[PDB]
């Protein structure tokens, strides 16, 4: 019959990259 | 009937860690 | 039909903040 509803939201993305070096 | 469309992309990941200490 | 498959992984998190101040 008709296609089901859309699936659930995917997994959370990966953690962000490290920030840059601090100020001098 | 068939499985529905793929779900939405997941939530964004958490922010990355603080960068290393600044250069001298 | 049944609900669709899970969505893709979300976007990567934002970059971290700048690191601690460096030595003098």
Author numbering:
A (entry chain B), B (entry chain C), C (entry chain A): 25 to 47, 50
From the paper:
Each chain adopts a well-extended PPII conformation with successive Gly-X-Y triplets.
In this study, in order to gain structural insights into an NH–π interaction between Gln and Phe and better understand its chemical properties, we solved a crystal structure of a collagen-like peptides (GPO)3GPQGFO(GPO)3, abbreviated as GPQGFO, and characterized the side chain interactions using several lines of evidence including circular dichroism, quantum chemical analysis, molecular dynamics simulation, and structural bioinformatics. The GPQGFO peptide crystallizes with the triple helical structure characteristic of collagen molecules with 1.385 Å resolution. Two axial pairs were, respectively, composed of Gln in the leading and Phe in the middle chains of the triple helices, the other was between the middle and trailing chains. The conformations were located at the region with dNM ~3.3 Å, θ ~10° and ω ~150°, well within the empirical cutoffs for NH–π interactions (dNM < 4.3 Å, −25° < θ < 25°, and ω > 120°) extracted from the previous data-mining of protein structures. The side chains were pointed in opposite directions (dNM = 7.4 Å), which did not form any interactions. In the GPQGFO structure, Gln and Phe, with Cα atoms separated by 7.7 Å, made a strong NH–π interaction. The MD data suggested that the Q-F pairs in the crystal structure should be maintained in solution to stabilize the protein, consistent with the observations in the CD experiments. From thermal unfolding experiments, we have demonstrated that NH–π interactions allow the side chain of Gln to interact with the π-system of Phe in an axial geometry that is less influenced by the environment.
